[PDB]
C-alpha cells in the first residue's frame, strides 16, 4: 500500500508495505532463502524492530543490482522510507537511528599510471 525506494552501491530495492501478519518476501523468496548471511538479515530487519512493530506489517520486496550487502542496505532504506511515507511521526526516530540518510559511498575509479585508485607501483631505494 505504501511504497519505498532504497539505493546502496548500485543496488535498488522496491518495497511495498501493507498492514498484515508479518510476511516478508524477496523476489518470490523468503529472507532466509535469499540471504544466507546473518548480518544481511539483521540489517534488513533493523528498521521494524526499531519501532517494536515488526509483525504488524507485511512487506513485498524486489531488488536488483549490487551484492548481498548492498542489496540488504537498499532493502532497509526502502523499508525506512516506506515507514516515513506511512506515518510522519516515524521520521524523527528513524533519522535518529540514521536510516533516513542515503549512503553515497561508491567505488573510486582506476587512475592513469597507478595500479588502483590509490595504490601506485613500487619505488625501491634499497
Amino acid at each position: 500500500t505504501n511504497y519505498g525506494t532504497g539505493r546502496r552501491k548500485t543496488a535498488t530495492a522496491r518495497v511495498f508495505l501493507s498492514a498484515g501478519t508479518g510476511k516478508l518476501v524477496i523476489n518470490n523468496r523468503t529472507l532466509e532463502q535469499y540471504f544466507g548471511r546473518e548480518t544481511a538479515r539483521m540489517v534488513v530487519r533493523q528498521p521494524l524492530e526499531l519501532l517494536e512493530a515488526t509483525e504488524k506489517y507485511d512487506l513485498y520486496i524486489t531488488v536488483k543490482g549490487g551484492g548481498i550487502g548492498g542489496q540488504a542496505g537498499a532493502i532497509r532504506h526502502g523499508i525506512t522510507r516506506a515507514l516515513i511515507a506511512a506515518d510522519e511521526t516515524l521520521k524523527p526516530v528513524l533519522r535518529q537511528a540514521g536510516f533516513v540518510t542515503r549512503d553515497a559511498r561508491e567505488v573510486e575509479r582506476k587512475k592513469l599510471g597507478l595500479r588502483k585508485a590509490r595504490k601506485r607501483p613500487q619505488f625501491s631505494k634499497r
Binding site: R37, E38, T39, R41, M42
Partner: protein
Amino acid sequence: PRRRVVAAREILPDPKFSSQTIAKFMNHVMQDGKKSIAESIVYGALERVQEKNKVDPVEFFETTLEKVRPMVEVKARRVGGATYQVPMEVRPSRRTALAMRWLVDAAAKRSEKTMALRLAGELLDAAEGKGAAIKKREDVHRMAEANKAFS
C-alpha cells in the same frame, strides 16, 4: 596529522550477542575482507570456551579483556640524542586495541589445528593468568616501572 581532528567510525554490534566489542574483535580477526569467516572463527571459539565452564560468553570475554588490558606505556622521546623512554598513561581506546591485538597475535602463534581452537585456548590462558598476551602486559608494566623515574 598537523591539523583537524578525525572522528571515530561506528562498528555495528554483532548479530548473536549484539556487542560492539565483539564486532571490533571480529574486525581484528578478519583478513582480506572475509568477515563471514571471521564471525565463524570467533563464534566457534566462543562456543568452545563456553563448553569448558558455563558462563555468559560476553561476560567471559570482557573479563578476560580487562585482565589483559595494559596500564602504562612509554613513548620514545628524542632529546639530546638519546632514546629517553618516558612512561605515560594511555587512553581506553588504545588499551582495548592493544589488548585485542595481543590476544589475536598470541592465538595466531599458538599451536592448535584451527584458529577457533587456538583462540579459545588463548582466552582460557588469559583467564587463568598465563599467556603470551599476559606476558606482553607484564613486560610493558616491567619496562614502564623501570623507567618510572622520569615524568
